[PDB]
Structure formats: structure tokens, C-alpha cells
Design a protein around this ligand. Sequence first.
Ligand code: A86
Ligand code: A86
Ligand code: A86
Ligand code: A86
Ligand code: A86
Ligand code: KC2
Ligand code: KC2
Ligand code: KC2
Lengths: 176, 70, 175, 193, 193, 166
Amino acid sequence: KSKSIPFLEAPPALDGTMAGDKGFDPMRLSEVVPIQWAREAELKHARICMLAVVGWVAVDLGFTVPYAPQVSSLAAHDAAVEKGAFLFLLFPIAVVEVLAGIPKCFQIMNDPNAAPGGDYKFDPLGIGASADMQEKEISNGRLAMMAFSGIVTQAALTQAPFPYTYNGMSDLVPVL
Amino acid sequence: AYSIPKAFIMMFCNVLVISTMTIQGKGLAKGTPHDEMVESFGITWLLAGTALGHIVGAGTILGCSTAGIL
Amino acid sequence: VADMEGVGPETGNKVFDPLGLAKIASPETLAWYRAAELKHSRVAMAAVTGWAWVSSGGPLFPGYLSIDQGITFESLGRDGYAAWAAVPEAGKFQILGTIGILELLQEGSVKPHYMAGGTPGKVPLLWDPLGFTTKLSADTLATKRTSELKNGRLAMIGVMSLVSAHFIPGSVPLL
Amino acid sequence: AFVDSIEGVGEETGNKIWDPLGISDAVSDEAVMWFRHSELKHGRVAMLATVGYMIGAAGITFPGEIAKGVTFASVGASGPYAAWDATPTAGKLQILTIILALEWAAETKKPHYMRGGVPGKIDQLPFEGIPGLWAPKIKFWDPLNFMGALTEEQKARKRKSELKNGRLAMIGIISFLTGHNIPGSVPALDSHF
Amino acid sequence: AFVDSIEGVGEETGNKIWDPLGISDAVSDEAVMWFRHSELKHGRVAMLATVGYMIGAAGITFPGEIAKGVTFASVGASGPYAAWDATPTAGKLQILTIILALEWAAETKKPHYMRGGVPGKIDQLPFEGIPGLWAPKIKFWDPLNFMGALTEEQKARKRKSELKNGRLAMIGIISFLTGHNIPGSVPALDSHF
Amino acid sequence: ELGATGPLGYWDPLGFSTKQPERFARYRAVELKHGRIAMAACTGYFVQSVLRWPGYLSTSAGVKFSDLPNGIAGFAKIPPLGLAQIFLFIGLMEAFTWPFYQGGLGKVPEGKLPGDVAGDLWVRYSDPEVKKHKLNVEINNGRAAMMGSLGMLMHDHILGTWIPPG
Ligand SMILES: CC(=O)O[C@H]1CC(C)(C)C(=C=C/C(C)=C/C=C/C(C)=C/C=C/C=C(C)/C=C/C=C(\C)C(=O)C[C@@]23O[C@]2(C)C[C@@H](O)CC3(C)C)[C@](C)(O)C1
Ligand SMILES: CC(=O)O[C@H]1CC(C)(C)C(=C=C/C(C)=C/C=C/C(C)=C/C=C/C=C(C)/C=C/C=C(\C)C(=O)C[C@@]23O[C@]2(C)C[C@@H](O)CC3(C)C)[C@](C)(O)C1
Ligand SMILES: CC(=O)O[C@H]1CC(C)(C)C(=C=C/C(C)=C/C=C/C(C)=C/C=C/C=C(C)/C=C/C=C(\C)C(=O)C[C@@]23O[C@]2(C)C[C@@H](O)CC3(C)C)[C@](C)(O)C1
Ligand SMILES: CC(=O)O[C@H]1CC(C)(C)C(=C=C/C(C)=C/C=C/C(C)=C/C=C/C=C(C)/C=C/C=C(\C)C(=O)C[C@@]23O[C@]2(C)C[C@@H](O)CC3(C)C)[C@](C)(O)C1
Ligand SMILES: CC(=O)O[C@H]1CC(C)(C)C(=C=C/C(C)=C/C=C/C(C)=C/C=C/C=C(C)/C=C/C=C(\C)C(=O)C[C@@]23O[C@]2(C)C[C@@H](O)CC3(C)C)[C@](C)(O)C1
Ligand code: KC2
Ligand code: KC2
Ligand code: KC2
């Protein structure tokens, strides 16, 4: 029985070696998608959403680079596209993806002796790849995914400052 | 999705397709249990079922919109 | 409580606690009470000394306190709470911040905290920078600490008398 | 802890468990521990709240200003009740934030009151041991440590007095609020409430 | 390198390592070497910068011309902070060029502060051993060899003094910058700052 | 062991029956009774939302079946004689037709099931598995119906219509 859903049996592929494992796979994607591919995708989305959340919050608070538009994060995409300097953020993304994801993706698909998904060996400071720091990475990334989804769909809906709620801190704190 | 009637029609079409479909002679309408379908076919049972459910839902929604019923 | 200093023949040879707070107090509660007593005693001693020195014809410091704003020492009237009212708010913040840093250091710097063992009122930074009292007997220093407490009691009733005389007129004699 | 493994029986009810509904008798010991913890929390909040209105009705405020744009007297010009609204939004936000921190810490302490722990004994040093967090070791309960001079037999009596005063306080705070709302509900209450 | 082995503990925090957060205990060994080298670099940069800012605020400036048409008094007339914008771009280009050379040369030395080198020990004579490059053997640190007349224990005492001065220096330089940006945030900074 | 299956198996988060297993039969009887009245009330709400009887509710009064709303107001706008007739009908049906307790409180039939109040003339499934499944769906529908009926009652009390705002 899975630890997360106590009325279903966990898949055999999940086991307990992977970081962030909680037996949560009710519809068993792990049989139709390789777990390493799924983990690489999970970590990629998690990292992109962490960066997106912190960048959105910074730009909304007002942290702006010189010569850039002085706009909120909701209109920042359109403003940057109009002003021009937004393809040079795609260019490093282009080289990183084409020269690290495609080879790593084909290694995960084909090679048996390949690094696990989301492992680029990126440890400049040597902080450590412990299983505590992988669990923390995964938990923060999942929280950032949900938080970014909420932030975008609330900012577009309400068109308000940082809280992205209609009333403000009053909705997070009804006592106010 | 916008309208509650549209959501209701799409949900009903998806449930009807999932109930009345049959893969390799196995289906809920043909008295195959949910657990056996889940083990035999996996999430391919939901993916194909909901894909055709969306196709028939689109057909009926567009027909009803053309006819003014919706 | 009997082991603690600050008791003298003035009040017999027993602890002057009519309301029995020391009875409630644990040993570390007694340490807290002695630390707070000492801090009040020292602060009020400095306060009353400064008050008397400023308001009893003493020489005020020379120069401008704030050259930008023009406030000057003799411009600050030699009067309790009027000097403080006329001091710049920036200078007030400087004084309060310096005291705050000193007391945060007293809390989180000395490892044997007065609550957890240690000794109340020990501040190694500020005391005897020039080593005035590095060559005194232990019992002589105990007598000196008793004298410190005794003198600062008079000091703190004195400073409360001064603020009372300032605000409520006719509160004190010899004024 | 259990039906009889918890203090709080007094001579007012003849040293009997005053449970007309029989809730304590019916639910399990885990629910009894939950109920005791909630009882003590309500009693403590009420002992705070009752003396905090009484001061509001008396009209005593700390000298000075609560913020640059509003004064301690300005915030309580509307009697006790209409004071929380008058307080600065940042101020009540900070109060609720620290209360949230205390509640979450007390819940995250491992020996849970339900699952094998003392009901009513929230940990006296919250925020200690949290990774990536530092706070001064200011004991939440008795920071001056008045408990070191008391024996266990005295602590039992004081816990009984705590429960009795707490119950009286939750009666009294509701009485004061009901007197403020309904004018003639509770006698012996002045127009300040 | 490893936290217990570093001359970082002082009498400010009870002769104990001061890591309120769980950083040093969460990071591996070489991350601490990186952090210590970074601490020393920040401390020394701010230790020079605070003195430079004080001199600029005081207005003590060299007698002469920085360029054929610009005076040090002219670039300092706009206060200590705007002097960086006032100085010629072609001069701060040379300053940043030599800083680039020094940083790259310090990073290129083999043992490496993260790979078995002393963290915070910038190698003397950084421009030696480089093919296709010559520079006179003027040591980066102590060009007059002041360290020669010091003993190892005295040098350890002076390393501790360096650290405790540098930390205060970065506190001071951020105080100056925040005092300029947000007015009245840092008192003791008159209009000259 | 009927009642207990589903997402959550046994679910006694306060341990009522665990502390007092002798009272499980009484609690089952009360649950079934509440579920039955709840299913009736929910069906009444759904069917009154769409269909209203034609005819005078009372010739003496001026009120028709069409003027009543579907809620507390609808129940209020009934003559006291009609309300008394409803009350006595419920009283007879619950005292002499379907008495859950043979005798006093907490005295449900030991031979019969806790909610076995129907007489000889009733639908009976002579199969243990089918009987168990049908009783399980009975009690589960009772739970869902009574939660939903509390929802309807609170919505109609607050707004006036059982359906809440969309
Ligand atoms: C307002 C009014 O009218 O009030 C009424 C009522 C009332 C209340 C009774 C009155 C008052 C005010 C009162 C009583 C004021 C009292 C004030 C008082 C008595 C203020 C002492 C300060 C001493 C200091 C600062 C000493 C530091 C000394 C330090 C820090 C030393 O280093 C001492 C030391 O170095 C030596 C010298 C020797 C060395 O070996 C080393 C040691 C460390 C040992 C009046 C005025 O009478 C009348
Ligand atoms: C009457 C009379 O006299 O008429 C004369 C006079 C007059 C008018 C002046 C004339 C002229 C013009 C002439 C002849 C002009 C000539 C121009 C010429 C020949 C221009 C070379 C440029 C080379 C470059 C930029 C190289 C950079 C190279 C670089 C960046 C390096 O140093 C690379 C480096 O790797 C080394 C090598 C060593 C390493 O340690 C360091 C690094 C890695 C940095 C005439 C035509 O002669 C006629
Ligand atoms: C009360 C209040 O709020 O105040 C406000 C205002 C105030 C105070 C202004 C503020 C500030 C700023 C602060 C705190 C600034 C601090 C600045 C700091 C700490 C500056 C160090 C410089 C060190 C240098 C240059 C070292 C050179 C060292 C050299 C050249 C040597 O090697 C000397 C030596 O080689 C010899 C020649 C011989 C050898 O045998 C021995 C050694 C190796 C030693 C704040 C923060 O805003 C607070
Ligand atoms: C007597 C004889 O001889 O034979 C009989 C014997 C026997 C056995 C009795 C038979 C039977 C079967 C019978 C009579 C069965 C009757 C069953 C019945 C009458 C079951 C109601 C369920 C209602 C529910 C669950 C309500 C949910 C309600 C929910 C989820 C809600 O909250 C409502 C709501 O959320 C919505 C939906 C919309 C939202 O905007 C919000 C609101 C809150 C408004 C036979 C075999 O047929 C014949
Ligand atoms: C053996 C032993 O010892 O113990 C055993 C035996 C014993 C003691 C007999 C037992 C029992 C019986 C107990 C304790 C039963 C408790 C029953 C309970 C607690 C029943 C609540 C109903 C609430 C309703 C219907 C609310 C409607 C609410 C409605 C319709 C509203 O809308 C109210 C409204 O305010 C709103 C929400 C909003 C406002 O805008 C509008 C208004 C004002 C209208 C136990 C548990 O078995 C234990
Ligand atoms: C014990 C407390 C204390 C300490 C330890 C301390 C240390 C230092 C140091 C360190 C070496 C420097 C460099 C420094 C500098 C200045 N101090 Mg300062 N100071 C303290 C107290 C006060 C008070 C009470 C006032 C004051 C002021 C000024 C002004 C004027 C600014 C101006 O006029 O714009 C300047 C430049 C006055 C003020 O801010 O007036 C608006 C003022 O009233 N300070 N101060
Ligand atoms: C028990 C709860 C509690 C705690 C633990 C706590 C801790 C700290 C700390 C930590 C060491 C700091 C550094 C700090 C600082 C400030 N607090 Mg705060 N505070 C608490 C409660 C209140 C209330 C009720 C108010 C308040 C305020 C302010 C203002 C004024 C800003 C301004 O004038 O704009 C400043 C600067 C007032 C406010 O928000 O005013 C708009 C206000 O009403 N605080 N507060
Ligand atoms: C619960 C089910 C139920 C049953 C089993 C039942 C049986 C009988 C029998 C057979 C034994 C007779 C002979 C009879 C006769 C009358 N019933 Mg009655 N009745 C039931 C329910 C209601 C309700 C809800 C109302 C009502 C009424 C009347 C009126 C008045 C008519 C008028 O007002 O002109 C008359 C004459 C209405 C009323 O009381 O009106 C003041 C009214 O609202 N009944 N009713």
C-alpha cells in the first residue's frame, strides 16, 4: 500500500531509492514513461519554476536592471519583447538545452550507464548532493511549481500587487 | 472551458465513452471489473477513453451550439 | 538569597524582601533579579551624576553638537528633559543604538549567561579598561561590590526624586 | 490523558467529573487529551482577554505612540471593542505572525499531546532545534523561572487553580462581550463594556 | 578550511563558532573554504573602501591633475560617491584592468583554496610563473616584507585582528552606502556623505 | 462491519464505538434513521425545485401549493392544522409502523438488524453478499444525503434558496 494513498498499491518502479519518493503515483505513469526521464522533466520544471517565482517576485517588488522597462511582471514579457532584448535570454537557453539536455536525454533513453535525470554534476561550490539536499531540492521545486501556477493565474485574474488577492493581506489574514 | 452546460456535457460524454468502450473485448459495460481493466490496460484505458470522449464531446457541443439548444 | 551580596547593617542582617519575591525566586530568578538591580543601579548612577554635573554649574562640552543643524552644547539648556528634547533625534538614535549593541553583546557574547550559571552584571568590555582593579583581594572586591549596590540605591532614589521634582512640583524637599 | 488521569475536579462540583452530556465518558482517551488541551488553551486565552478588556474599559494605555501616524490613545478612543480595527494593520499582522509561529512550533514539537504527550504542556522553548533558524533562548513560559522554587505537590495545586481561574475567565470574557453587545444581558457592567 | 580548524572564532561570541543558521553544518568541506576566502576578500575590499570613502567625504585629495584637463578636486567636488562617475572612464578602465589581472592570477595558482590551499591566503607575487608574461618581483602583500619580523603566534593574532577588522569594515561600508541611498537610515553621516 | 468500507475504513476519529462497543447498534440505528430522513428531505428539495402540486392547500386559507417556496418559508406558509396533521402522521409512522427501538432508548432489536423496521411485506435480498452491498450503499447514501441536507438547510436559511450562488 502506498504511503500517500492508503487505498492503493504503490507501483514497483517507485521503490524508495529516489529522492522525494512518497508513493504518490495513482495513475501509474512510471510504467509507460521511464522514471529517469520523468525525474529529469520534474527537476527541469521545478528549477524553472523556482527561478520564475523568485524573478516574478523581485520584478514585482521593483528590482529592475537599468535600461529595462519599469513594468510589473505581468506586462514584463510584452515590454521586453517590444523593447528587443529578450532573444538574448533565449540564446543561452538555446545552447544549454541543445548541448546538455538533448545528449543527456538520449543518454537516459538509450545508455544504461548514464547519470540520473536532472544530474548535471553541477557542484561548483561543492555544497553536496546528499539525500537531504536532494529531498529539499525536490520539495522546494514542487512547492515552486504550485506557487508559480497560483501566482500567474491569480495575477492575470486580479491585476493587483504582490499578494495577488483581491483584498490583499486581508484574504490571507481574514482577522484584518 | 467556459459554460457549466459545456462542462456537464463534456463530463457526461467522457464518462459514457469510458463506460461503454471496449478494448480487446474487455469493458465496463461488458461486465469487466474496474480493477481488472486498470491492471490489464493501465492509464491507456483513461487516455484513449478521454480522447474519444473529447472528440464526441466536441461533436455534440458544436452540434448543440449550431442548433441553439445550448 | 542569603549567599548573594548587597546586605548590610543598614537593614539589620537579613534580606529586605517584605513581599517575598526572593521566596518565589529560583536561583536563576535571583540571578535575573540581581542582574536587573545592577543594571538599574549603574544606569541611574550615571544618570544622577550627569544630571547634577550639568545642572550644578558644571562646564558643558565645547563646540557644536551638530554643525549642520547648528545645535550647540550651551544651546541645549542646562535643564533636565530640555537638554534631551533639544538633542537631535539622530543623536538620540545613536545613543540608544549604542546601548542596544552593548546589551546585545552582554546577552549573546558572554558564554556563561547569568541565567545559566555565570555571574550577574559582569561586562568585561566596559570595566577597567586601564586595569584600575586588577590587583585587589577577593574579599576587598566583595566589599567594593556591596558599596556599589549601596551607593547606587541612593543614586536611583535620587534620579527618581529628580524626575518627580521636574514633573510634579513640590514632590521633593531641598528644591 | 484519561477519564481520571487528568486534574481539574474541584469541591464546587463535589469532587466529581461535571459531564452532564457524558462526552468524556463516550469519546476515547485521545479525544480526552485533545479536549483538555483545548480547555487549557481557551482558559489561558480568556485570562489574557478578560484582563485586557478590563484595562481597555479602564482606558489605560502605554504613554507614547504605537506608530508615527497614530497614537496609543488614538487606537483606543473607541472603547474596548472597537480597538483591534483601529490598531495598525502592520501591527496586528506582526502579532498574528508571531502567534502563528508559536502555534506551529508547539504543534511540531515531536512528543505530541495527543500522540503520547502531556496535554496542556506546550513546550517552554519553542523555535529551538528548527534547522536554519535561530532565536534567543527566552523561555516562553516562566522566563524568570519561578518554577524552580515549587515542588510537584505545589505544582498540582497551581495547575488546579489555573484550570479554575481559566474556566472563570472564559465565562467572564464572554460576559463582557455580551454586555457590550446586548446592554442589559449581564448586570454589574458599566457602559464602558 | 574545516570550520573547527579556522581562525574565525573570537571573543565576540563566547569563543565559539557563530553560525546561527545551519550553513556550515549543511555545506560540505570545500564550500567552507570558498566561504572563508570570500569572507576575507569582502573584508579586505571593504576595509580599503571604508577608508577611501572617509577620505573622499573629508575632501583630502591629491594636489595635481588626474588628466590633462581634469583635477582630483574637480572629480571630488560631487562628494565621495559621485567621484567614481566623475573620474575618467579611461582611468577606471585601467583600474578594473589591473583588478582583472590580479583576480585571474590569484585564481590560477595551483593548490587552489578549495583544492588544498589556504583559504584567504592570496598568493604573493601573483604574476610569476606565467609564460609570456614578466612583472617585477614586488609582492602583492607586504612588499616591504613587514611579516618577516613576526612570529607564527603573533601572525595568528594578526590574522584574527584582520578578520575582526574586516567584518566591521563591511558593516561600515554598507552603512555608508545605505546612508547615502536611504536618508537618515544610518546616523553619524552628515551632509558630506 | 457495515458502514466500514471505502476511502476510509473504520472511521471513528473520537473513538465512540471503540470506547463503548455495546452502543454500536444504537449508533447504527440513529445513523440509519438520520440517513433515511435525509434522503427523503433531499429528494423533497430536488423535486420541489421543479414540480409543484396543483390544487388548494386549504380551502379555508388562501394558500395554494404553488405559492409556497421550497424551504423554511415554504414550510412556514402552511396552516397550523396541516402542520399538526404532518406531525401526527410522522408520529404514527414512527411509533407504530417503523419503531426503531422495540422498547426504550438503547434497546434496538437483538434478533433483527438495527434499522430493520419494515414488516413482512418488504423487498428482501436472499443472498448475503448482495444484502451486504445493498445495506452498505444504503448507509453510505444516508451519510451523503444528510451532509447534503445540512448544506441545503444552511443555504436556504442564509439566502433563501437551497442552491447557492454560482
Ligand atoms: C532631588 C532631591 O532633592 O532629592 C531629595 C531626596 C534624595 C533622593 C534623598 C536626594 C537625592 C539624590 C541622591 C541620594 C543621589 C545620590 C547619588 C550618588 C550617591 C551617586 C554616586 C555616583 C557614583 C559614581 C558615578 C561612582 C563611580 C565609580 C566608579 C565607576 C569606580 O570606578 C569606583 C572605584 O574607582 C574607585 C573610586 C576606587 C578604585 O579602587 C576602583 C573602584 C571601582 C572601586 C536628595 C538630593 O538628597 C534630596
Ligand atoms: C618613411 C617611412 O619610414 O615610411 C614608413 C612609415 C609608416 C608610414 C609608419 C609605415 C607604416 C605602417 C606600418 C609599417 C604599420 C605596421 C603595423 C603592424 C605590423 C601592426 C601589428 C599589429 C599587431 C597586433 C595588433 C598584435 C597583437 C597581439 C597580441 C594581442 C598579443 O600580444 C598576443 C600575445 O601572445 C603574445 C604575442 C605574447 C603573450 O605573452 C601575450 C599575448 C597572449 C597577449 C610604412 C608603410 O612602413 C612607411
Ligand atoms: C555610534 C554609531 O552608530 O556609529 C555609526 C557611525 C560609524 C562609526 C562611522 C560607522 C562606521 C563605520 C565603521 C565601523 C568603519 C570601520 C572601518 C574599519 C574597520 C577600517 C579598517 C581599516 C584598516 C586598514 C586600512 C588596515 C591597514 C593595514 C596595514 C597597511 C598593515 O598591514 C599594517 C601592518 O603591516 C604593518 C605596517 C606592520 C606589521 O607588523 C603589522 C601590520 C600587518 C598590521 C557606523 C557603522 O555607521 C556606526
Ligand atoms: C417499499 C417496497 O416495497 O419496495 C421498495 C424497497 C426499497 C429497498 C426501499 C427500494 C428502494 C429504494 C429507494 C426508495 C431509494 C431512495 C433513495 C434516495 C431518496 C436517495 C437520496 C439520496 C440523496 C443524496 C445522496 C443527496 C446528496 C446531496 C448533495 C451531495 C448536496 O450537498 C446537494 C448539492 O450539492 C448539490 C447536488 C448541488 C450544489 O449546488 C450544492 C447542494 C448542497 C445544493 C425499492 C427496491 O426500490 C422498492
Ligand atoms: C453515552 C454517553 O455518555 O454519551 C453519548 C450519548 C449522547 C450524550 C446522547 C450523545 C449525544 C447527542 C449529541 C451530543 C448531539 C449533538 C448534536 C448536534 C451538535 C447537532 C447540531 C445541529 C446543527 C444544525 C442542524 C445546524 C443548522 C444550521 C442552520 C440551518 C443555519 O444556517 C444557522 C445559521 O447560523 C448560520 C450558519 C448562518 C446565519 O447566517 C443564519 C443562521 C443563524 C440560521 C452522544 C454523542 O451519542 C454521546
Ligand atoms: C555614545 C554615543 C555616540 C557614539 C559612540 C558616537 C560615535 C560617533 C563616531 C565614531 C567614531 C562618529 C564618526 C560620529 C560622528 C557624528 N556624530 Mg556621534 N556618537 C554618539 C552620540 C552622538 C550624538 C548624541 C550626536 C552625534 C552626532 C554626530 C555627528 C553629527 C552629525 C550632524 O550634525 O549631521 C557626527 C558626524 C550628532 C548628530 O547626529 O547630530 C544631528 C549628535 O547629536 N553622536 N559619532
Ligand atoms: C508581540 C508582537 C510584536 C513583536 C514580537 C514585534 C517585534 C518587532 C521587532 C523585532 C525585534 C521589530 C524590529 C519591530 C519593529 C516595529 N514594530 Mg513591532 N512587534 C510586535 C507588535 C507590534 C505592533 C502592534 C506594532 C508594531 C509596530 C512596529 C514598528 C512601527 C513601524 C511604523 O511606525 O511604521 C516597527 C518599526 C507598529 C506598526 O506596525 O506601526 C505601523 C505597531 O503598531 N509591532 N517589531
Ligand atoms: C400527513 C398526511 C395527511 C393525511 C394522512 C391526511 C388525512 C386526512 C383525512 C383522512 C384520514 C381526512 C378526512 C383529511 C381531511 C382534511 N385534511 Mg388532511 N391529511 C394529511 C395532511 C394534511 C395537510 C398538510 C393539510 C390537511 C388538510 C385537511 C383538511 C382541510 C382543508 C381545508 O383547509 O379546506 C381536511 C378537511 C389541510 C388543513 O388542515 O387545512 C386547514 C392541510 O393543510 N391534511 N385529511
